[PDB]
Design a protein around this ligand. Sequence first.
Ligand SMILES: CCc1oc2cc(O)ccc2c1C(=O)c1cc(Br)c(O)c(Br)c1
Ligand SMILES: CCc1oc2cc(O)ccc2c1C(=O)c1cc(Br)c(O)c(Br)c1
Lengths: 115, 115
Amino acid sequence: CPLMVKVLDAVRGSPAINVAMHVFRKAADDTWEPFASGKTSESGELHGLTTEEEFVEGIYKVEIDTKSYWKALGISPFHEHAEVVFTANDSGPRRYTIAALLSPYSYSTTAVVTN
Amino acid sequence: CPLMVKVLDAVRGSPAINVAMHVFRKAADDTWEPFASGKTSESGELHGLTTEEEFVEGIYKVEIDTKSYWKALGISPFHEHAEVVFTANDSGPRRYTIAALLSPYSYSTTAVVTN
Ligand SMILES: CCc1oc2cc(O)ccc2c1C(=O)c1cc(Br)c(O)c(Br)c1
Ligand SMILES: CCc1oc2cc(O)ccc2c1C(=O)c1cc(Br)c(O)c(Br)c1
């Protein structure tokens, strides 16, 4: 599993469940092409987005639909989405965990990169 | 000053100085058109991006060039940039401060919306 996303809710102290996200990859003409998508499970995790063979070097964008998450909880949040843009696999294959901790007016994001 | 951006450095415990950023407004065709830009001051702040008359309701993106900041310090970063995408909404008088706290592999962003 070369790309995993984990989302937590800082208001409830819980995984953020059923959060949709779309992953894009920058094409040679500098446009964002669709790459993968999914939603978080009961654990707040989204696994299985890609494979080692498909997840080539490139610039990737993870767009996490945080606004829909908060709206369903009755909250009108600040951000439209949380965006995570990064170069992947520039020194060979790595495994990436993208993590996001969500509040209505704030989010924090980090990455855990392992070889 | 309806929109200000403040950037801090979590490795050095200091304002993040000379950080470049661009602000975009989402257009009718779903493209991002340039709106304003600048670099943070010695206090880590960027003032004077827009005026109350120009800062109408809509979806705005602040793209902060965090990669160049870390590169200038000789530190290898994860993100290409930090992206803050939000809707501006007229609910009485509002001033927006977008704040970002930067680490090489993580950032946190919040909004302080005041009257
Ligand atoms: C979305 C996950 C996450 O994002 C953060 C942002 C922060 O600033 C501080 C903490 C977190 C955080 C975690 O608590 C967390 C991460 C992993 Br990885 C994990 O396995 C488990 Br359990 C918990
Ligand atoms: C309480 C201030 C604060 O706490 C954080 C926690 C985070 O994880 C990330 C960022 C912040 C953060 C700021 O960016 C901030 C700092 C100053 Br100083 C300031 O004047 C303004 Br406005 C905003």
